[PDB]
Design a protein around this ligand. Structure first.
Ligand code: HEM
Length: 243
């Protein structure tokens, strides 16, 4: 019952957890850039535990408040993992509150988020998702773009009757300074949305963005998605909690 995707399946796939060395959780990520056994699907809640426990070795786990909503942010650098884990690279990912909804990024060991290996993804449990067919709701949304310390933040507006998702994420500490949805749409009553996006930031305006994501949870209590660009520095993952 896990849905989600990544911007580069050569590097990252999303699925259900199956990692015997780090068991636990359901929504999961696989580093396809790695060979077995290190391409196992590992639950995000398991990775969150590891990020909590290995803080003295360089991981971090932090609750970040945006408005009245909390996003739990995990940073896992390759330097904090055992030497055998070299191929696993670097992660930043967030959880939407206590919901089983995760969004994040990855890049190869020795790279930066500006490198070609920069990959963004999202994952969530769809078991009890329902999408309203009418009315409007807003979401407090956090975005990850090349940092586990500095987030993007904004408000998305879902018009469930029109099937539109609108809004902008902004922040001061990332390559992206602003990320606006453009024509992001969904069939009313269904969870999956897609559209375009524009970004501003350290490389200037970039109109090449494409967006995909979905609503999660009873009454669409959450959303998550990715925006990817010709400029991979601008690739962003996001997660939102319904206000
Ligand atoms: C990202 C996905 C991960 C995968 C696929 C993975 C995979 C594995 C595998 C296959 C083993 C057993 C073989 C070995 O020792 O290398 C293992 C052990 C271990 N892993 Fe991971 N791991 C992941 C994340 C992490 C993280 C984030 C940490 C800590 C920051 C970590 C710390 C450890 C530790 C402490 C052991 C026990 C062996 C030792 O003490 O060196 N792992 N992992």
């Amino acid at each position: 019952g896990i849905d989600g995707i990544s911007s580069n399946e050569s590097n990252i796939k999303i699925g259900a957890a199956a990692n015997a060395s780090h068991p636990g959780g359901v929504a999961a990520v696989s580093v396809q850039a790695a060979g077995a056994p290190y391409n196992a699907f590992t639950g995000f809640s398991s990775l969150k535990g590891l990020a909590q426990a290995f803080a003295a070795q360089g991981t971090s786990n932090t609750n970040v408040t945006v408005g009245s909503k909390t996003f739990n942010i995990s940073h896992i650098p390759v330097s904090a993992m055992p030497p055998s884990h070299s191929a696993l690279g670097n992660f930043n990912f967030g959880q939407v509150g206590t919901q089983e909804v995760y969004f994040g990024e990855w890049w190869k060991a020795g790279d930066t988020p500006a490198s070609a290996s920069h990959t963004v993804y999202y994952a969530g449990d769809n078991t009890n998702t329902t999408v309203p067919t009418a009315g409007t709701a807003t979401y407090t949304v956090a975005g990850i773009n090349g940092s586990g310390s500095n987030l993007l933040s904004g408000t998305f507006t879902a018009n469930y009757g029109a099937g539109t998702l609108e809004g902008t994420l902004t922040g001061t500490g990332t390559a992206v300074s602003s990320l606006s949805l453009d024509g992001v749409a969904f069939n009313p009553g269904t969870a999956a949305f897609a559209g375009l996006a524009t970004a501003n930031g350290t490389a200037g305006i970039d109109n090449s963005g494409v967006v995909q994501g979905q609503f999660f949870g009873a009454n669409a209590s959450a959303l998550a998605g990715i925006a990817q660009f010709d400029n991979v520095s601008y690739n962003t993952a996001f997660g939102g909690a319904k206000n």
